[PDB]
PDB file of all heavy atoms in Angstrom:
ATOM      1  N   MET V  70      -0.706   9.298   3.545  1.00 43.96           N
ATOM      2  CA  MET V  70      -1.183   9.684   2.262  1.00 43.96           C
ATOM      3  C   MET V  70      -0.356  10.658   1.548  1.00 43.96           C
ATOM      4  O   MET V  70      -0.134  10.463   0.362  1.00 43.96           O
ATOM      5  CB  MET V  70      -2.766  10.165   2.405  1.00 43.96           C
ATOM      6  CG  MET V  70      -3.640   8.963   2.790  1.00 43.96           C
ATOM      7  SD  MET V  70      -5.624   9.588   2.798  1.00 43.96           S
ATOM      8  CE  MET V  70      -5.227  10.969   4.120  1.00 43.96           C
ATOM      9  N   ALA V  71       0.438  11.443   2.368  1.00 41.64           N
ATOM     10  CA  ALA V  71       1.466  12.296   1.679  1.00 41.64           C
ATOM     11  C   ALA V  71       2.602  11.347   1.053  1.00 41.64           C
ATOM     12  O   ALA V  71       2.974  11.527  -0.058  1.00 41.64           O
ATOM     13  CB  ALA V  71       2.006  13.307   2.571  1.00 41.64           C
ATOM     14  N   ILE V  72       3.039  10.316   1.842  1.00 41.40           N
ATOM     15  CA  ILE V  72       4.016   9.389   1.376  1.00 41.40           C
ATOM     16  C   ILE V  72       3.458   8.816  -0.044  1.00 41.40           C
ATOM     17  O   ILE V  72       4.232   8.678  -0.943  1.00 41.40           O
ATOM     18  CB  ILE V  72       4.340   8.335   2.450  1.00 41.40           C
ATOM     19  CG1 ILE V  72       4.919   8.768   3.604  1.00 41.40           C
ATOM     20  CG2 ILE V  72       5.115   7.138   1.719  1.00 41.40           C
ATOM     21  CD1 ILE V  72       6.243   9.479   3.297  1.00 41.40           C
ATOM     22  N   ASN V  73       2.262   8.411  -0.062  1.00 40.21           N
ATOM     23  CA  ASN V  73       1.669   7.784  -1.238  1.00 40.21           C
ATOM     24  C   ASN V  73       1.678   8.659  -2.495  1.00 40.21           C
ATOM     25  O   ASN V  73       2.077   8.303  -3.544  1.00 40.21           O
ATOM     26  CB  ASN V  73       0.318   7.309  -0.981  1.00 40.21           C
ATOM     27  CG  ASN V  73      -0.301   6.396  -2.095  1.00 40.21           C
ATOM     28  OD1 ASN V  73       0.367   5.448  -2.324  1.00 40.21           O
ATOM     29  ND2 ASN V  73      -1.366   6.852  -2.708  1.00 40.21           N
ATOM     30  N   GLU V  74       1.409  10.021  -2.157  1.00 39.47           N
ATOM     31  CA  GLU V  74       1.426  11.006  -3.288  1.00 39.47           C
ATOM     32  C   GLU V  74       2.876  11.239  -3.732  1.00 39.47           C
ATOM     33  O   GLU V  74       3.157  11.483  -4.896  1.00 39.47           O
ATOM     34  CB  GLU V  74       0.778  12.242  -2.759  1.00 39.47           C
ATOM     35  CG  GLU V  74      -0.706  12.030  -2.574  1.00 39.47           C
ATOM     36  CD  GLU V  74      -1.505  11.909  -3.900  1.00 39.47           C
ATOM     37  OE1 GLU V  74      -1.190  12.684  -4.727  1.00 39.47           O
ATOM     38  OE2 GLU V  74      -2.412  11.181  -3.873  1.00 39.47           O
ATOM     39  N   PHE V  75       3.863  11.259  -2.843  1.00 42.11           N
ATOM     40  CA  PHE V  75       5.253  11.346  -3.215  1.00 42.11           C
ATOM     41  C   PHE V  75       5.722  10.161  -4.072  1.00 42.11           C
ATOM     42  O   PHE V  75       6.325  10.203  -5.079  1.00 42.11           O
ATOM     43  CB  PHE V  75       6.232  11.558  -2.082  1.00 42.11           C
ATOM     44  CG  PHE V  75       5.944  12.710  -1.135  1.00 42.11           C
ATOM     45  CD1 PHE V  75       6.032  12.576   0.199  1.00 42.11           C
ATOM     46  CD2 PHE V  75       5.643  13.913  -1.731  1.00 42.11           C
ATOM     47  CE1 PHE V  75       5.691  13.696   1.008  1.00 42.11           C
ATOM     48  CE2 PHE V  75       5.367  15.083  -0.941  1.00 42.11           C
ATOM     49  CZ  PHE V  75       5.328  14.922   0.494  1.00 42.11           C
ATOM     50  N   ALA V  76       5.293   8.955  -3.584  1.00 41.72           N
ATOM     51  CA  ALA V  76       5.648   7.645  -4.233  1.00 41.72           C
ATOM     52  C   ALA V  76       5.070   7.707  -5.594  1.00 41.72           C
ATOM     53  O   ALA V  76       5.821   7.124  -6.533  1.00 41.72           O
ATOM     54  CB  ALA V  76       5.045   6.505  -3.472  1.00 41.72           C
ATOM     55  N   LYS V  77       3.941   8.185  -5.915  1.00 42.90           N
ATOM     56  CA  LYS V  77       3.422   8.176  -7.194  1.00 42.90           C
ATOM     57  C   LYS V  77       4.314   8.818  -8.239  1.00 42.90           C
ATOM     58  O   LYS V  77       4.524   8.262  -9.456  1.00 42.90           O
ATOM     59  CB  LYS V  77       2.161   8.970  -7.292  1.00 42.90           C
ATOM     60  CG  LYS V  77       0.888   8.282  -6.594  1.00 42.90           C
ATOM     61  CD  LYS V  77      -0.368   9.174  -6.719  1.00 42.90           C
ATOM     62  CE  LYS V  77      -1.452   8.486  -5.878  1.00 42.90           C
ATOM     63  NZ  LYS V  77      -2.723   9.191  -6.186  1.00 42.90           N
ATOM     64  N   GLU V  78       5.056   9.753  -7.903  1.00 41.26           N
ATOM     65  CA  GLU V  78       5.976  10.418  -8.719  1.00 41.26           C
ATOM     66  C   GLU V  78       7.445   9.766  -8.700  1.00 41.26           C
ATOM     67  O   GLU V  78       8.088   9.718  -9.764  1.00 41.26           O
ATOM     68  CB  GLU V  78       6.116  12.005  -8.495  1.00 41.26           C
ATOM     69  CG  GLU V  78       4.782  12.663  -8.806  1.00 41.26           C
ATOM     70  CD  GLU V  78       4.998  14.149  -8.792  1.00 41.26           C
ATOM     71  OE1 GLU V  78       6.020  14.660  -9.039  1.00 41.26           O
ATOM     72  OE2 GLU V  78       4.043  14.795  -8.229  1.00 41.26           O
ATOM     73  N   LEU V  79       7.835   9.432  -7.519  1.00 41.31           N
ATOM     74  CA  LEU V  79       9.231   9.139  -7.291  1.00 41.31           C
ATOM     75  C   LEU V  79       9.775   7.846  -7.433  1.00 41.31           C
ATOM     76  O   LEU V  79      10.900   7.524  -7.527  1.00 41.31           O
ATOM     77  CB  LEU V  79       9.684   9.738  -5.874  1.00 41.31           C
ATOM     78  CG  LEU V  79       9.515  11.254  -5.741  1.00 41.31           C
ATOM     79  CD1 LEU V  79       9.731  11.627  -4.282  1.00 41.31           C
ATOM     80  CD2 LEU V  79      10.454  11.972  -6.707  1.00 41.31           C
ATOM     81  N   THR V  80       8.823   6.693  -7.275  1.00 43.40           N
ATOM     82  CA  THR V  80       9.234   5.435  -7.323  1.00 43.40           C
ATOM     83  C   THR V  80       8.417   4.522  -8.165  1.00 43.40           C
ATOM     84  O   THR V  80       7.211   4.721  -8.335  1.00 43.40           O
ATOM     85  CB  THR V  80       9.455   4.832  -5.905  1.00 43.40           C
ATOM     86  OG1 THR V  80      10.061   3.601  -5.885  1.00 43.40           O
ATOM     87  CG2 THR V  80       8.169   4.769  -5.160  1.00 43.40           C
ATOM     88  N   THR V  81       9.138   3.435  -8.646  1.00 44.04           N
ATOM     89  CA  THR V  81       8.395   2.416  -9.336  1.00 44.04           C
ATOM     90  C   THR V  81       8.055   1.329  -8.340  1.00 44.04           C
ATOM     91  O   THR V  81       7.408   0.218  -8.653  1.00 44.04           O
ATOM     92  CB  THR V  81       9.190   1.884 -10.490  1.00 44.04           C
ATOM     93  OG1 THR V  81      10.476   1.327  -9.940  1.00 44.04           O
ATOM     94  CG2 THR V  81       9.374   2.842 -11.601  1.00 44.04           C
ATOM     95  N   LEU V  82       8.495   1.346  -7.085  1.00 45.44           N
ATOM     96  CA  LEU V  82       8.255   0.262  -6.123  1.00 45.44           C
ATOM     97  C   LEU V  82       6.727   0.269  -5.879  1.00 45.44           C
ATOM     98  O   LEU V  82       6.022   1.265  -5.868  1.00 45.44           O
ATOM     99  CB  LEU V  82       8.931   0.634  -4.837  1.00 45.44           C
ATOM    100  CG  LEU V  82      10.386   0.566  -4.729  1.00 45.44           C
ATOM    101  CD1 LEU V  82      11.018   1.212  -3.572  1.00 45.44           C
ATOM    102  CD2 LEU V  82      10.938  -0.940  -4.850  1.00 45.44           C
ATOM    103  N   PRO V  83       6.202  -0.926  -5.522  1.00 42.06           N
ATOM    104  CA  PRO V  83       4.762  -0.966  -5.125  1.00 42.06           C
ATOM    105  C   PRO V  83       4.583  -0.385  -3.643  1.00 42.06           C
ATOM    106  O   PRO V  83       5.062  -0.998  -2.736  1.00 42.06           O
ATOM    107  CB  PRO V  83       4.503  -2.477  -5.070  1.00 42.06           C
ATOM    108  CG  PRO V  83       5.703  -3.188  -5.710  1.00 42.06           C
ATOM    109  CD  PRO V  83       6.835  -2.147  -5.431  1.00 42.06           C
ATOM    110  N   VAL V  84       3.955   0.721  -3.621  1.00 41.60           N
ATOM    111  CA  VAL V  84       3.616   1.470  -2.424  1.00 41.60           C
ATOM    112  C   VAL V  84       2.214   1.644  -2.312  1.00 41.60           C
ATOM    113  O   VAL V  84       1.585   2.245  -3.255  1.00 41.60           O
ATOM    114  CB  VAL V  84       4.396   2.811  -2.457  1.00 41.60           C
ATOM    115  CG1 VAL V  84       4.069   3.586  -1.127  1.00 41.60           C
ATOM    116  CG2 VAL V  84       5.906   2.523  -2.497  1.00 41.60           C
ATOM    117  N   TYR V  85       1.553   1.390  -1.113  1.00 43.41           N
ATOM    118  CA  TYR V  85       0.188   1.563  -0.907  1.00 43.41           C
ATOM    119  C   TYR V  85      -0.077   2.020   0.416  1.00 43.41           C
ATOM    120  O   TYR V  85       0.741   1.876   1.401  1.00 43.41           O
ATOM    121  CB  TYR V  85      -0.615   0.281  -1.063  1.00 43.41           C
ATOM    122  CG  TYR V  85      -0.509  -0.455  -2.382  1.00 43.41           C
ATOM    123  CD1 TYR V  85       0.554  -1.392  -2.658  1.00 43.41           C
ATOM    124  CD2 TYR V  85      -1.251  -0.015  -3.364  1.00 43.41           C
ATOM    125  CE1 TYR V  85       0.722  -1.807  -3.922  1.00 43.41           C
ATOM    126  CE2 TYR V  85      -1.142  -0.529  -4.605  1.00 43.41           C
ATOM    127  CZ  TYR V  85      -0.121  -1.405  -4.936  1.00 43.41           C
ATOM    128  OH  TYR V  85      -0.022  -2.054  -6.219  1.00 43.41           O
ATOM    129  N   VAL V  86      -1.245   2.831   0.589  1.00 43.40           N
ATOM    130  CA  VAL V  86      -1.675   3.358   1.762  1.00 43.40           C
ATOM    131  C   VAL V  86      -3.105   2.714   2.034  1.00 43.40           C
ATOM    132  O   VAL V  86      -3.984   2.756   1.130  1.00 43.40           O
ATOM    133  CB  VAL V  86      -1.689   5.000   1.908  1.00 43.40           C
ATOM    134  CG1 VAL V  86      -2.499   5.633   0.839  1.00 43.40           C
ATOM    135  CG2 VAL V  86      -2.371   5.371   3.220  1.00 43.40           C
ATOM    136  N   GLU V  87      -3.164   2.182   3.147  1.00 38.79           N
ATOM    137  CA  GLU V  87      -4.421   1.487   3.439  1.00 38.79           C
ATOM    138  C   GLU V  87      -4.960   1.847   4.826  1.00 38.79           C
ATOM    139  O   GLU V  87      -4.275   1.958   5.782  1.00 38.79           O
ATOM    140  CB  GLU V  87      -4.331   0.048   3.405  1.00 38.79           C
ATOM    141  CG  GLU V  87      -4.115  -0.486   1.967  1.00 38.79           C
ATOM    142  CD  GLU V  87      -5.231  -0.450   1.038  1.00 38.79           C
ATOM    143  OE1 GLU V  87      -6.353  -0.302   1.462  1.00 38.79           O
ATOM    144  OE2 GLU V  87      -4.976  -0.356  -0.217  1.00 38.79           O
ATOM    145  N   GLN V  88      -6.340   1.945   4.958  1.00 37.12           N
ATOM    146  CA  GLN V  88      -6.968   2.141   6.138  1.00 37.12           C
ATOM    147  C   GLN V  88      -6.961   0.703   6.749  1.00 37.12           C
ATOM    148  O   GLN V  88      -7.429  -0.254   6.254  1.00 37.12           O
ATOM    149  CB  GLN V  88      -8.473   2.595   5.944  1.00 37.12           C
ATOM    150  CG  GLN V  88      -9.086   3.316   7.140  1.00 37.12           C
ATOM    151  CD  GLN V  88      -9.564   2.410   8.281  1.00 37.12           C
ATOM    152  OE1 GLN V  88      -9.611   1.229   8.145  1.00 37.12           O
ATOM    153  NE2 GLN V  88      -9.951   3.150   9.301  1.00 37.12           N
ATOM    154  N   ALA V  89      -6.412   0.625   8.004  1.00 38.62           N
ATOM    155  CA  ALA V  89      -5.991  -0.685   8.560  1.00 38.62           C
ATOM    156  C   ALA V  89      -7.186  -1.578   8.905  1.00 38.62           C
ATOM    157  O   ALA V  89      -6.995  -2.885   8.942  1.00 38.62           O
ATOM    158  CB  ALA V  89      -5.219  -0.471   9.889  1.00 38.62           C
ATOM    159  N   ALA V  90      -8.333  -0.923   9.215  1.00 36.77           N
ATOM    160  CA  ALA V  90      -9.527  -1.901   9.384  1.00 36.77           C
ATOM    161  C   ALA V  90     -10.017  -2.464   8.174  1.00 36.77           C
ATOM    162  O   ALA V  90     -10.463  -3.537   8.170  1.00 36.77           O
ATOM    163  CB  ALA V  90     -10.710  -1.195  10.192  1.00 36.77           C
ATOM    164  N   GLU V  91     -10.026  -1.666   7.142  1.00 35.82           N
ATOM    165  CA  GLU V  91     -10.452  -2.248   5.814  1.00 35.82           C
ATOM    166  C   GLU V  91      -9.515  -3.316   5.427  1.00 35.82           C
ATOM    167  O   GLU V  91      -9.837  -4.371   4.967  1.00 35.82           O
ATOM    168  CB  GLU V  91     -10.525  -1.055   4.772  1.00 35.82           C
ATOM    169  CG  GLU V  91     -11.667  -0.179   4.956  1.00 35.82           C
ATOM    170  CD  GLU V  91     -11.748   0.961   3.842  1.00 35.82           C
ATOM    171  OE1 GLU V  91     -10.950   1.049   2.877  1.00 35.82           O
ATOM    172  OE2 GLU V  91     -12.672   1.823   4.001  1.00 35.82           O
ATOM    173  N   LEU V  92      -8.195  -3.102   5.586  1.00 34.41           N
ATOM    174  CA  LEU V  92      -7.178  -4.006   5.117  1.00 34.41           C
ATOM    175  C   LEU V  92      -7.300  -5.365   5.864  1.00 34.41           C
ATOM    176  O   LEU V  92      -7.191  -6.477   5.305  1.00 34.41           O
ATOM    177  CB  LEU V  92      -5.719  -3.434   5.274  1.00 34.41           C
ATOM    178  CG  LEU V  92      -4.622  -4.355   4.862  1.00 34.41           C
ATOM    179  CD1 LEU V  92      -4.696  -4.708   3.470  1.00 34.41           C
ATOM    180  CD2 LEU V  92      -3.337  -3.687   5.184  1.00 34.41           C
ATOM    181  N   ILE V  93      -7.523  -5.348   7.166  1.00 32.95           N
ATOM    182  CA  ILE V  93      -7.620  -6.607   7.818  1.00 32.95           C
ATOM    183  C   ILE V  93      -8.892  -7.352   7.590  1.00 32.95           C
ATOM    184  O   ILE V  93      -8.935  -8.548   7.571  1.00 32.95           O
ATOM    185  CB  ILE V  93      -7.419  -6.410   9.495  1.00 32.95           C
ATOM    186  CG1 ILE V  93      -6.975  -7.683  10.095  1.00 32.95           C
ATOM    187  CG2 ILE V  93      -8.737  -5.889   9.994  1.00 32.95           C
ATOM    188  CD1 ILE V  93      -6.654  -7.517  11.610  1.00 32.95           C
ATOM    189  N   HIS V  94      -9.915  -6.638   7.169  1.00 30.89           N
ATOM    190  CA  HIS V  94     -11.135  -7.265   6.767  1.00 30.89           C
ATOM    191  C   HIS V  94     -11.058  -7.871   5.298  1.00 30.89           C
ATOM    192  O   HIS V  94     -11.591  -8.987   5.166  1.00 30.89           O
ATOM    193  CB  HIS V  94     -12.397  -6.380   6.874  1.00 30.89           C
ATOM    194  CG  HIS V  94     -12.925  -6.126   8.218  1.00 30.89           C
ATOM    195  ND1 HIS V  94     -12.366  -5.311   9.106  1.00 30.89           N
ATOM    196  CD2 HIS V  94     -14.054  -6.731   8.774  1.00 30.89           C
ATOM    197  CE1 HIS V  94     -13.005  -5.435  10.168  1.00 30.89           C
ATOM    198  NE2 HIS V  94     -14.094  -6.132  10.148  1.00 30.89           N
ATOM    199  N   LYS V  95     -10.416  -7.164   4.396  1.00 33.51           N
ATOM    200  CA  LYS V  95     -10.392  -7.611   3.166  1.00 33.51           C
ATOM    201  C   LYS V  95      -9.262  -8.670   2.707  1.00 33.51           C
ATOM    202  O   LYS V  95      -9.488  -9.422   1.797  1.00 33.51           O
ATOM    203  CB  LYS V  95     -10.320  -6.359   2.134  1.00 33.51           C
ATOM    204  CG  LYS V  95     -11.418  -5.573   2.079  1.00 33.51           C
ATOM    205  CD  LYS V  95     -11.268  -4.249   1.349  1.00 33.51           C
ATOM    206  CE  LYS V  95     -10.890  -4.419  -0.049  1.00 33.51           C
ATOM    207  NZ  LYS V  95     -12.028  -5.073  -0.892  1.00 33.51           N
ATOM    208  N   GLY V  96      -8.085  -8.393   3.349  1.00 31.54           N
ATOM    209  CA  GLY V  96      -6.878  -8.898   2.888  1.00 31.54           C
ATOM    210  C   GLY V  96      -6.549  -8.065   1.623  1.00 31.54           C
ATOM    211  O   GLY V  96      -7.177  -7.226   1.253  1.00 31.54           O
ATOM    212  N   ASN V  97      -5.447  -8.515   1.064  1.00 33.60           N
ATOM    213  CA  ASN V  97      -4.974  -7.883  -0.287  1.00 33.60           C
ATOM    214  C   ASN V  97      -4.082  -8.880  -0.906  1.00 33.60           C
ATOM    215  O   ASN V  97      -3.099  -9.330  -0.415  1.00 33.60           O
ATOM    216  CB  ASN V  97      -4.255  -6.496   0.146  1.00 33.60           C
ATOM    217  CG  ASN V  97      -4.060  -5.657  -1.159  1.00 33.60           C
ATOM    218  OD1 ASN V  97      -3.313  -6.123  -2.017  1.00 33.60           O
ATOM    219  ND2 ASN V  97      -4.646  -4.496  -1.210  1.00 33.60           N
ATOM    220  N   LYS V  98      -4.358  -9.047  -2.180  1.00 34.44           N
ATOM    221  CA  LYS V  98      -3.632 -10.062  -3.012  1.00 34.44           C
ATOM    222  C   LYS V  98      -2.085  -9.673  -3.191  1.00 34.44           C
ATOM    223  O   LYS V  98      -1.286 -10.446  -3.528  1.00 34.44           O
ATOM    224  CB  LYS V  98      -4.249 -10.404  -4.387  1.00 34.44           C
ATOM    225  CG  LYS V  98      -4.151 -11.945  -4.638  1.00 34.44           C
ATOM    226  CD  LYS V  98      -4.886 -12.355  -5.938  1.00 34.44           C
ATOM    227  CE  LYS V  98      -4.613 -13.781  -6.355  1.00 34.44           C
ATOM    228  NZ  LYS V  98      -5.194 -14.036  -7.782  1.00 34.44           N
ATOM    229  N   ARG V  99      -1.892  -8.319  -3.094  1.00 33.44           N
ATOM    230  CA  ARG V  99      -0.506  -7.767  -3.196  1.00 33.44           C
ATOM    231  C   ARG V  99       0.202  -7.847  -1.990  1.00 33.44           C
ATOM    232  O   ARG V  99       1.483  -7.456  -1.913  1.00 33.44           O
ATOM    233  CB  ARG V  99      -0.540  -6.428  -3.744  1.00 33.44           C
ATOM    234  CG  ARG V  99      -1.185  -6.338  -5.018  1.00 33.44           C
ATOM    235  CD  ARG V  99      -1.753  -4.929  -5.122  1.00 33.44           C
ATOM    236  NE  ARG V  99      -2.562  -4.961  -6.324  1.00 33.44           N
ATOM    237  CZ  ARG V  99      -3.731  -5.607  -6.530  1.00 33.44           C
ATOM    238  NH1 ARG V  99      -4.275  -6.221  -5.354  1.00 33.44           N
ATOM    239  NH2 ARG V  99      -4.563  -5.467  -7.627  1.00 33.44           N
ATOM    240  N   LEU V 100      -0.403  -8.044  -0.864  1.00 36.59           N
ATOM    241  CA  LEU V 100       0.328  -8.157   0.392  1.00 36.59           C
ATOM    242  C   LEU V 100       0.565  -9.587   0.643  1.00 36.59           C
ATOM    243  O   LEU V 100      -0.238 -10.502   0.654  1.00 36.59           O
ATOM    244  CB  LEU V 100      -0.762  -7.690   1.496  1.00 36.59           C
ATOM    245  CG  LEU V 100      -0.320  -7.928   2.985  1.00 36.59           C
ATOM    246  CD1 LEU V 100       0.904  -6.861   3.210  1.00 36.59           C
ATOM    247  CD2 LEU V 100      -1.514  -7.471   3.821  1.00 36.59           C
ATOM    248  N   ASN V 101       1.916  -9.797   0.656  1.00 34.75           N
ATOM    249  CA  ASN V 101       2.427 -11.233   0.621  1.00 34.75           C
ATOM    250  C   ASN V 101       3.496 -11.416   1.650  1.00 34.75           C
ATOM    251  O   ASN V 101       3.803 -10.449   2.370  1.00 34.75           O
ATOM    252  CB  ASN V 101       2.797 -11.660  -0.705  1.00 34.75           C
ATOM    253  CG  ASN V 101       3.894 -10.858  -1.387  1.00 34.75           C
ATOM    254  OD1 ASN V 101       4.936 -10.525  -0.721  1.00 34.75           O
ATOM    255  ND2 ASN V 101       3.723 -10.463  -2.543  1.00 34.75           N
ATOM    256  N   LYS V 102       4.137 -12.563   1.790  1.00 37.96           N
ATOM    257  CA  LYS V 102       5.043 -12.792   2.793  1.00 37.96           C
ATOM    258  C   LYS V 102       6.313 -12.058   2.715  1.00 37.96           C
ATOM    259  O   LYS V 102       7.154 -12.107   3.667  1.00 37.96           O
ATOM    260  CB  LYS V 102       5.420 -14.380   2.797  1.00 37.96           C
ATOM    261  CG  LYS V 102       6.191 -14.692   1.568  1.00 37.96           C
ATOM    262  N   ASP V 103       6.620 -11.420   1.596  1.00 41.11           N
ATOM    263  CA  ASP V 103       7.770 -10.636   1.326  1.00 41.11           C
ATOM    264  C   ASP V 103       7.485  -9.067   1.437  1.00 41.11           C
ATOM    265  O   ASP V 103       8.217  -8.160   1.344  1.00 41.11           O
ATOM    266  CB  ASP V 103       8.474 -10.712   0.058  1.00 41.11           C
ATOM    267  CG  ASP V 103       9.006 -12.085  -0.068  1.00 41.11           C
ATOM    268  OD1 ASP V 103       9.369 -12.762   0.865  1.00 41.11           O
ATOM    269  OD2 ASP V 103       9.072 -12.580  -1.270  1.00 41.11           O
ATOM    270  N   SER V 104       6.178  -8.750   1.895  1.00 41.42           N
ATOM    271  CA  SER V 104       5.800  -7.380   2.060  1.00 41.42           C
ATOM    272  C   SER V 104       6.348  -6.784   3.368  1.00 41.42           C
ATOM    273  O   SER V 104       6.537  -7.469   4.317  1.00 41.42           O
ATOM    274  CB  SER V 104       4.206  -7.110   2.024  1.00 41.42           C
ATOM    275  OG  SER V 104       3.682  -7.609   0.802  1.00 41.42           O
ATOM    276  N   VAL V 105       6.396  -5.399   3.453  1.00 43.08           N
ATOM    277  CA  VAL V 105       6.581  -4.783   4.657  1.00 43.08           C
ATOM    278  C   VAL V 105       5.402  -3.958   4.964  1.00 43.08           C
ATOM    279  O   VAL V 105       5.023  -3.096   4.094  1.00 43.08           O
ATOM    280  CB  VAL V 105       7.939  -4.025   4.765  1.00 43.08           C
ATOM    281  CG1 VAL V 105       8.055  -3.336   6.150  1.00 43.08           C
ATOM    282  CG2 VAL V 105       9.037  -4.960   4.570  1.00 43.08           C
ATOM    283  N   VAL V 106       4.875  -4.026   6.211  1.00 43.71           N
ATOM    284  CA  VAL V 106       3.666  -3.199   6.498  1.00 43.71           C
ATOM    285  C   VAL V 106       4.263  -2.152   7.621  1.00 43.71           C
ATOM    286  O   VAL V 106       4.806  -2.592   8.631  1.00 43.71           O
ATOM    287  CB  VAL V 106       2.495  -3.957   7.118  1.00 43.71           C
ATOM    288  CG1 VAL V 106       1.489  -3.142   7.674  1.00 43.71           C
ATOM    289  CG2 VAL V 106       2.068  -4.945   6.073  1.00 43.71           C
TER     290      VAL V 106
END
């Protein structure tokens, strides 16, 4: 979550922080074959 807060100011890259159980249940449309987790 600190990384996400720094990213908000410092980069235009798509950066997200996710609770891993929520993420595996929901999926995410922005998580694709070129993402890095």
Side-chain angles (χ1 to χ4, degrees), residues 70-101 103-106:
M70 289 184 305
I72 292 302
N73 191 56
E74 291 289 317
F75 302 141
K77 287 180 185 190
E78 291 189 41
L79 297 174
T80 185
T81 60
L82 292 163
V84 174
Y85 299 91
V86 54
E87 292 293 334
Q88 205 287 344
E91 293 183 357
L92 179 59
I93 202 174
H94 282 76
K95 295 173 57 68
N97 191 295
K98 220 176 171 193
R99 298 151 193 73
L100 172 66
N101 56 49
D103 296 331
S104 302
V105 176
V106 175

